[PDB]
A paper describes a structure:
In contrast, the DNACAA backbone is bent towards the minor groove, leading to a contact with N-terminal Arg-217 and Lys-218. Instead of contacting the DNA backbone, Arg-258 assumes an alternative conformation in which it turns inside of the major groove, forming a water-mediated contact with Gln-265. The Gln-265, in turn, recognizes C6’ via a direct hydrogen bond. In addition, the CAA sequence is recognized by a hydrophobic interaction between Ile-262 and the T11 methyl group. The HOXB13-DNACAA structure (2.2 Å) contains chains of water molecules that interact with both HOXB13 amino-acids and each of the DNA bases in the CAA sequence. A relatively large solvent channel (6.4 Å in smallest diameter) exists between the α3 helix of HOXB13 and DNATCG while this space is occupied by well-defined water-net including Arg-258 in HOXB13-DNACAA structure. Thus, the optimal binding of HOXB13 to the CAA sequence can be rationalized by the visible interactions that contribute to the enthalpy of binding (∆H). However, as predicted, the CAA site displayed much higher change in enthalpy, and larger loss of entropy compared to those of the TCG site. These results indicate that HOXB13 binding to one optimal site, CAA, is driven by enthalpy, whereas strong binding to the other, TCG, is due to a lower loss of entropy. The CAA site does not contain a CpG dinucleotide, and thus cannot be inheritably methylated.
Author numbering: 217 to 277
The structure:
DNA sequence: TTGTGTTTTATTGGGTCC
DNA sequence: GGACCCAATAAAACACAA
């Protein structure tokens, strides 16, 4: 039960930018986002997974 | 400024790939 | 084959009606 740490503005900007380019992260873009954000590749994957739940939820209104 | 519904991280679990 | 996906869920933090 180790507790969540919200992502900074600069971190979210990199994630959002890449998401807008492709909803599904690739291995190489995951590596590069990790370098650019200091988030682990796992965190990034989880973020994309999470981000598609959000889009799904917001279309549905 | 505050209460609390909403949103954001993070885990767990089932399915495909197979 | 762990690596992907997505759904249900919890807890921390946020957003914004009062």
């Amino acid at each position: 039960r180790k507790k969540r740490i919200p992502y900074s503005k600069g971190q979210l900007r990199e994630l959002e930018r890449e998401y807008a380019a492709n909803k599904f992260i690739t291995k190489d873009k995951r590596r590069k986002i990790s370098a650019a954000t200091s988030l682990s590749e796992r965190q990034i994957t989880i973020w994309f997974q999470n981000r598609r739940v959000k889009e799904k939820k917001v279309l549905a209104k």
